[PDB]
Nucleic acid binder design. Sequence first.
DNA 1: GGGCTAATGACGGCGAATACCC
DNA 2: GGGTATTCGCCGTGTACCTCTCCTAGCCC
RNA 3: CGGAGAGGUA
Lengths: 99, 513, 99, 76, 49, 420, 50, 129
Amino acid sequence: LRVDPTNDRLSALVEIYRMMRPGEPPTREAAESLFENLFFSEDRYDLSAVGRMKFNRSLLREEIEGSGILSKDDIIDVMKKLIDIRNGKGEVDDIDHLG
Amino acid sequence: TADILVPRNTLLHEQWCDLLEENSVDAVKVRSVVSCDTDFGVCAHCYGRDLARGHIINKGEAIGVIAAQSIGEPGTQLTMAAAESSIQVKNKGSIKLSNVKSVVNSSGKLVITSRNTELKLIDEFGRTKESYKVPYGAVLAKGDGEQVAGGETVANWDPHTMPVITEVSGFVRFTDMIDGQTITRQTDELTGLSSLVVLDSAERTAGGKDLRPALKIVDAQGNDVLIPGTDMPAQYFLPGKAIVQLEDGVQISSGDTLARIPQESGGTKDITGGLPRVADLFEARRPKEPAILAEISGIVSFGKETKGKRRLVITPVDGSDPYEEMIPKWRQLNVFEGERVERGDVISDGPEAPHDILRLRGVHAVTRYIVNEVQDVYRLQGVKINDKHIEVIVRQMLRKATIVNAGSSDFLEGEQVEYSRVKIANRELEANGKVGATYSRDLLGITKASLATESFISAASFQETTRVLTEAAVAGKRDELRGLKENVIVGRLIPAGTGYAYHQDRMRRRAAG
Amino acid sequence: HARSTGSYSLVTQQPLGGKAQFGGQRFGEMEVWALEAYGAAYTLQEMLTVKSDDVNGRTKMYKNIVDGNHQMEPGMPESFNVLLKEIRSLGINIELEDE
Amino acid sequence: ARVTVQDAVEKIGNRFDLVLVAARRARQMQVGGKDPLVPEENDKTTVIALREIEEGLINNQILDVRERQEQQEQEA
Amino acid sequence: AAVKEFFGSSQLSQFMDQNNPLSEITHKRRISALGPGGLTRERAGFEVR
Amino acid sequence: TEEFDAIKIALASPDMIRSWSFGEVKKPETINYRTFKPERDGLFCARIFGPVKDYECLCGKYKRLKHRGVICEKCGVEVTQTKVRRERMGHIELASPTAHIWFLKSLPSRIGLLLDMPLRDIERVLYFESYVVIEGGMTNLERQQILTEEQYLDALEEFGDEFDAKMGAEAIQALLKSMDLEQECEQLREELNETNSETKRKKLTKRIKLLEAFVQSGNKPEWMILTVLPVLPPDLRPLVPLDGGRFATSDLNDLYRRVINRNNRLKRLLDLAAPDIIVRNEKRMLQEAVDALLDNGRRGRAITGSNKRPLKSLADMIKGKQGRFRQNLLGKRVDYSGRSVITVGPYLRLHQCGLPKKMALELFKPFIYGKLELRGLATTIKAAKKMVEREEAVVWDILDEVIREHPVLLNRAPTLHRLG
Amino acid sequence: SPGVFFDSDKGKTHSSGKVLYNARIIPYRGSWLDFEFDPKDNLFVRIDRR
Amino acid sequence: MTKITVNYTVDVKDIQPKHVRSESNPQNQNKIRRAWVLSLSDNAMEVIQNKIKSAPARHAYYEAIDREVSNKWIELMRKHTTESLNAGAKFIMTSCGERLEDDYCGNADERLIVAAQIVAETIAADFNR
DNA sequence: GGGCTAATGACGGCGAATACCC
DNA sequence: GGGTATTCGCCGTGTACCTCTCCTAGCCC
RNA sequence: CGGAGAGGUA
């Protein structure tokens, strides 16, 4: 947060739109639309059933299903368990494990 | 004795090797390609004779390609007593010591300082049979010209930590002592000792990095006591993790540890082997915190401490005093203020980078280092390669040098050292010397040296092509078709082998000849 | 497979084409270095200039061998001519320091 | 014929100009102008030239003196 | 067009190596870590190999 | 062969580029597409690059093989030897100047270092996105500095005919025109005489080194901006149609058709005095096309139909892996060569190898022809061909004769040393 | 498999050693998400490889 | 046009660091033009606008004036070197090439501004016809 | 008919352009 | 200030052969 | 004989 150069939604969206697309003078509505489509539209970002299942299993949820799109709770969970893995409470996942 | 047993500049075949064998000799100076002064090529005698024949190297033999392929062929085979514990001589022979910084002190201790001291084991002849490196601080019950049995501990030290043995008597004054910054308060007295720990040499504090704790050894009267015979200064400037064993206010004898610096008992995992290791020697890749060397002789001291990275001023006794240099703050150092250093003396501890070895320790030193490391890699797989190939590869890596004082250069132009020598020879031959001209050799990797070729054709056609062609076009270069590969591309007799006689003739046919 | 004379490319005089008479075998730069390690100097010149690229050289040497002798013409390989032309194609000049 | 070049290497230590002189000798026995000094076995000019050089009958001295002299008699 | 491109010119739509019933049955049971969405041949890769 | 001792490298002037070309390329056509006749004066032009056939004009005018030292005076075809078509080069006259892609995105940006101004600004001005003061007047702002639209306008109303600023390669050409190298060299060396600061003298020396490099190269920096773009000879980028709906051919021909189409459109727009926005956009996309032709990879991928793969540009097959392709790898194949599986022969002396009879026959074919014609066993090359293809017992003795002393080299494909 | 992958970024020593961490979000279709660490222990986010 | 041309020349206040540039590296250019502008007033602007009715011609004459000030500045450095040598200066060879002694060295900014002022006076005289 | 006509699951190295503690 | 200390692109990728496909198409005229 | 992708070989 201290290093973060933005402190409000509009500036964050503008910067995200800019680093998605170099040039292209940004408007708030366009940045909002792009951010919603890339992560909250069920026509551009889908995990599918297996993706959601593995997503819940990695984060240790009892659920085996859920929405195909990313959500705020999912992102904050990824934050929390990544911080945990830095803390040593979590364990790195194998990359060639057949699971 | 001074009896000559080898003729002037003659090839050393099997009979000469034998004659050296019964008349045992420890070392032989041989004309190397690195020492070769021949321009645009290599002297025959400077090379050797290793071919499919016992005769001397033939004139016109493309030895560079042979060396490259002789290094490449065993590449397919490359896959990927105790050190730093105690020196135990496993044979029977005289004990000899080289580059000692040591003074004999009480309890019969030959306390040897610095890492620059080497221990040979001279056999019945001048030849050595065992070799070891004596670290900073050691206890020796043996001396020069003393016979020792096999498996005998001629030199020993604590395998888990390095103790700093005091060499003079008197109280210890804690200089540059700031409480809470330089060291943390920790007093554990068992018999008069303390557990004060100097903080890690990464980041100590705000004030413990701008100053560095030191321990001066002075007599009861307080007068400064010097140590004649060693470059280790009387004021022990404590490095990181140096636990101060001796407290202030107690007279110390000679033979007592002052500071303990823990070690890893050897086997540190910072090494890589095999084909990538050979490649990175040939590319002169930075070894990821190289042990930087003392780049000039003379007394040394700290400068403006902790300006991000600490500056160390080396002031020669007759040279240019303002010679501050840089030191990163993530290394463990061996040299402290008021310690006499010289060319090639290590500043930090770790692997050496080839660049600083070449620039400072000399071209022969870097050639020896590269040859030794590459040949060791080939020994690991039990494949033997004549070192003349590694030597010619080294000679090819260092074709460039940076000009300091120019004759026709621009005081910073990295120029072919061959061209630098031909110009300095031309100017010295004439009755006028201009300016000049001073050059310092710098090492380039195989890729960089190939791009630093005099001819743009070779670099362009077999490495980065766009960049080389653009630089050639903008610079307006011209190449006299030089090496073999240029003629390979052009498609005419390469100046080597049976072709060498032809092209050489053409070189005579030029200049209206 | 083997061959002595047959198909050639329409961009260069290197021998390749089909399987009615496949082109000559690819004597790469590795084997060029192998010859360079020997005093193999002429052999490189025949195997790169007259046996590979120089169409004038190819014809002259074929006529010479048929005529009952083994003599060579030096030649100017067409591969370097192609490289020269396309360097000139980018507005980067190549010229010959005529002897 | 001869398969080993050791004797020619001993005669011509450089063994690169040896290739040149052997090629010269072989070419003007193959191309008209002279005849071999060592009797034939339906062998190619190569091994004939090798066997000559091993016997020390043809070298750079013999070759260039023969070239000189044949130039004087051909010119006038 | 998309379906035909997938089934004809993909990098995992391979001509069946058909000289033995073993060749067939291995080719159909093959598991290629390559392809779109997976590895690349120039990986090295020492971990995944 | 041609005699030479050295190769020079230098940048190309528009004048000598025009000297290279024997004609101006105008039409962006290779053939008539559905009809396989080449279009003049398109990328393939007998009037420009010479006839496709040997010693005969291709217009329907000359069929006699006599005009090889003179050109066709009945039409525009420059009838010569067919080999001339492999060496004649062409050119296209760009309506607007275009930058060379290498001198822009390369880490040692030669334009950037010569102008002492970052490649980010170079791409912004070249992409028609930012103004730069090109040799202003008494303006309070800097003589040479970047500007975007708003400050450029504010200056335009603020400063009249004392302010010049332009778009694209025209602006960079103006800067490079305005620079005199010798004057700057003299200025810097005079400054070194008075200046005594380490940094000032060091940067003076660096600028002097670059300037003397350009001076000794004999290259005017104006030559470094492309006014005329040379087009490679047709044969070295040959036209090979594939039967069916596809019209596939060399990628170079496609890229050059793109560039010539763009040049024709831009020239048409300028001839009609089109509005500034349209001609500027046409110039931008012409810059895109030329930079794609010179080197695909620094301006965004240029993709062809039905294949998600960039077209190979001039630089892409200049560059090679490993090494320049056609010189020795890849691949430099060679005649009189063969390949076979190897068997053990334990009856062979150390100087011998066992070679198949068929391989010996069709490797040593010219030797067989020569020996057969010398021994009177054949009367012509055709007779030798018949004799060798019949593979009778007669040619076996001939092959024995030609193989008796003649040695051959055996070679392993992975060659790690000379004994390989 | 699409999901959450906590892998380790190695070789980022910068004369300080220390293995860093990375959390990658893989969808079956869409843009990947990347939460990687830095030597300053500051969390940096990349959409795809932006 | 105007028989009198106001000048901003030979002022003691005209000594100030001329290192203004909006991009990287401060060496020559982006200062020479500013130098010979600072020695002229706006009256020069109006005079050249009335005298010359062609913008390319105006820019060409601006380049001519810049080349004139550069030539005069080079003359100033060579004169400074000559007078220093007559004053007993020595060629100091440093690892940047040639320079003069510290007590004999001048500075580029003052020479440049003197050249600019003198050329501005010359141009003002040129406007007086 | 057609004449123009328009991504990471790489890895290691490295130079260039800023980034950041003391 | 300055020296890391990153971040931003460029770049390199054994050899040679065999087999196999699969090859600018959109489109407003 | 214009160029990509795949397998197998060494």
